[PDB]
């Protein structure tokens, strides 16, 4: 089974899942210097207010907020996209120190934990068949840094008491995305693939600039997560992230100046 141990972490995940040094793998890192204005990139749309949160997964992996795709109630358009996109989950990778944590990494730079918003291209009816397109996902990547305390997050926090080890759920409804985003909404954006095995090639990664501020406390709770299930020894989910791949044949563009 897949993780990120020593024994079964992102060094090993190719024996199982080739493409994991195929031609658009993620992340990357994010050369600020490299990366080129484009003008033809739209605004992007986030459109959360009528977003529907469901239940929250500890996965073994990592946790997901899982929201009701059923209807377009919670979607993301414009930017490099083409069409309608739909909020399915969100989730986070995170460090065990502060100094790492995400998966993208800007300059070099690690961040102490990365958001990922999970979207799906309304065109291909579901996430399963999604996730088989080369246009299937749009994941919205938001840095976390230490320092103040994010209110919209805290939540999330709260809960997480009570998904403590893999497999563990919670109902978790009524949760506001919109409280985890940054004030700008500028990006870079980049054809990738999930940063998880899979590792399919279908995501349009849109990464914005501006990271939002979470307090130390907030951090330390998700360290307290567990890759086990309950019964089982116990190992800190904390690190579950894969470092930046090869970039390759890719251009990164940025929406602005
Ligand atoms: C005795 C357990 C097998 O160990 C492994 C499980 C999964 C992988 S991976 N990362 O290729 O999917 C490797 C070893
Ligand atoms: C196809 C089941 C796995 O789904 C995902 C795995 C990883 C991501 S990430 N970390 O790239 O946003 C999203 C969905
Ligand atoms: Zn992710």
């Given at each position: 089974?897949?993780?990120?141990?020593?024994?079964?972490?992102?060094?090993?995940?190719?024996?199982?899942?080739?493409?994991?040094?195929?031609?658009?793998?993620?992340?990357?890192?994010?050369?600020?210097?490299?990366?080129?204005?484009?003008?033809?990139?739209?605004?992007?749309?986030?459109?959360?207010?009528?977003?529907?949160?469901?239940?929250?997964?500890?996965?073994?992996?990592?946790?997901?907020?899982?929201?009701?795709?059923?209807?377009?109630?919670?979607?993301?358009?414009?930017?490099?996209?083409?069409?309608?996109?739909?909020?399915?989950?969100?989730?986070?990778?995170?460090?065990?120190?502060?100094?790492?944590?995400?998966?993208?990494?800007?300059?070099?730079?690690?961040?102490?934990?990365?958001?990922?918003?999970?979207?799906?291209?309304?065109?291909?009816?579901?996430?399963?068949?999604?996730?088989?397109?080369?246009?299937?996902?749009?994941?919205?990547?938001?840095?976390?840094?230490?320092?103040?305390?994010?209110?919209?997050?805290?939540?999330?926090?709260?809960?997480?008491?009570?998904?403590?080890?893999?497999?563990?759920?919670?109902?978790?409804?009524?949760?506001?995305?919109?409280g985890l985003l940054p004030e700008?909404?500028?990006?870079?954006?980049?054809?990738?693939?999930?940063?998880?095995?899979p590792l399919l090639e279908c995501?349009?990664?849109?990464?914005?600039?501006?990271?939002?501020?979470?307090?130390?406390?907030?951090?330390?709770?998700?360290?307290?997560?567990?890759?086990?299930?309950?019964?089982?020894?116990?190992?800190?989910?904390?690190?579950?992230?894969?470092?930046?791949?090869?970039?390759?044949?890719?251009?990164?563009?940025?929406?602005?100046?």
């Amino acid at each position: 089974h897949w993780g990120y141990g020593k024994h079964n972490g992102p060094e090993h995940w190719h024996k199982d899942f080739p493409i994991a040094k195929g031609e658009r793998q993620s992340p990357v890192d994010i050369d600020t210097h490299t990366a080129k204005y484009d003008p033809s990139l739209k605004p992007l749309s986030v459109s959360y207010d009528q977003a529907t949160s469901l239940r929250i997964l500890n996965n073994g992996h990592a946790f997901n907020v899982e929201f009701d795709d059923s209807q377009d109630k919670a979607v993301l358009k414009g930017g490099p996209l083409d069409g309608t996109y739909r909020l399915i989950q969100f989730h986070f990778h995170w460090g065990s120190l502060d100094g790492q944590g995400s998966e993208h990494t800007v300059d070099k730079k690690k961040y102490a934990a990365e958001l990922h918003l999970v979207h799906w291209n309304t065109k291909y009816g579901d996430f399963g068949k999604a996730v088989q397109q080369p246009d299937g996902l749009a994941v919205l990547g938001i840095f976390l840094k230490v320092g103040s305390a994010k209110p919209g997050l805290q939540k999330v926090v709260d809960v997480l008491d009570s998904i403590k080890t893999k497999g563990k759920s919670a109902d978790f409804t009524n949760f506001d995305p919109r409280g985890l985003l940054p004030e700008s909404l500028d990006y870079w954006t980049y054809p990738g693939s999930l940063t998880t095995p899979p590792l399919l090639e279908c995501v349009t990664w849109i990464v914005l600039k501006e990271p939002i501020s979470v307090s130390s406390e907030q951090v330390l709770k998700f360290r307290k997560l567990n890759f086990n299930g309950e019964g089982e020894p116990e190992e800190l989910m904390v690190d579950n992230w894969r470092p930046a791949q090869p970039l390759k044949n890719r251009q990164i563009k940025a929406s602005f100046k």
